[PDB]
Design a protein around this ligand. Structure first.
Ligand SMILES: Cc1noc(-c2ccccc2)c1CO
Length: 209
């Protein structure tokens, strides 16, 4: 059973701007998602300092980068706090609405897309390189859910029946046909070494066989 929701008008405009604006420095998407993963690991680690049982779903705190040339997907996995159903449908957008509005005003005030993280909506930079994004997420207080959007103004949410994650978030980028350089090992290493050198968790790049 799948539920289809419309994006809030502000987020829907930001997504259509990110897809249709010809911006060359597309590599910043990886920094934004790695930074989001780092935040999510901070929250579960902090919660566990007063409640060690919060880690029963998984003690490891890491970020995995998994390119797949055959599927043309780049997957960013983290074992962070994860996201609830309410997060995917309401709470993340409600927190963002002000940053999304402010980000559009800044884009006319001399700012470029690369400052998207300063407004808390960096996740949507995924659509610089991806035609479709799938998010698998698992929060200690909720079930495993699958979020998906190809932009176009709507997204879907469903209960995920696949491989249980335990805890964390998996972002699956279905890359555009002209953005396959981000499936290359030496390219990913360059972006990590240039944009995410100071992340307080291990970032493991999975090499394809
Ligand atoms: C802000 C914001 N608004 O929505 C999200 C989000 C992230 C993952 C899946 C679905 C929505 C964010 C995170 O930056």
């Amino acid at each position: 059973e799948v539920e289809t929701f419309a994006f809030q008008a502000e987020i829907a405009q930001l997504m259509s701007l990110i897809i249709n604006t010809f911006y060359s420095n597309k590599e910043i998407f990886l920094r934004e998602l790695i930074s989001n993963s780092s935040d999510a690991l901070d929250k579960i680690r902090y919660e566990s300092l007063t409640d060690p049982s919060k880690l029963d779903s998984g003690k490891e705190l890491h970020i995995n980068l998994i390119p797949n040339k055959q599927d043309r997907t780049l997957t960013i996995v983290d074992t962070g706090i994860g996201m609830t159903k309410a997060d995917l449908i309401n709470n993340l957008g409600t927190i963002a609405k002000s940053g999304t509005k402010a980000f559009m005003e800044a884009l006319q005030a001399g700012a470029d897309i690369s400052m998207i993280g300063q407004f808390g909506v960096g996740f949507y930079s995924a659509y610089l390189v991806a035609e479709k994004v799938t998010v698998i997420t698992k929060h200690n207080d909720d079930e495993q859910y699958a979020w998906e959007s190809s932009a176009g103004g709507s997204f879907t949410v469903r209960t995920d029946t696949g491989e249980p994650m335990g805890r964390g978030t998996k972002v699956i980028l279905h890359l555009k046909e002209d953005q396959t350089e981000y499936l290359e090992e030496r390219r990913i290493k360059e972006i990590v070494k240039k944009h995410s050198q100071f992340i307080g968790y291990p970032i493991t790049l999975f090499v394809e066989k």
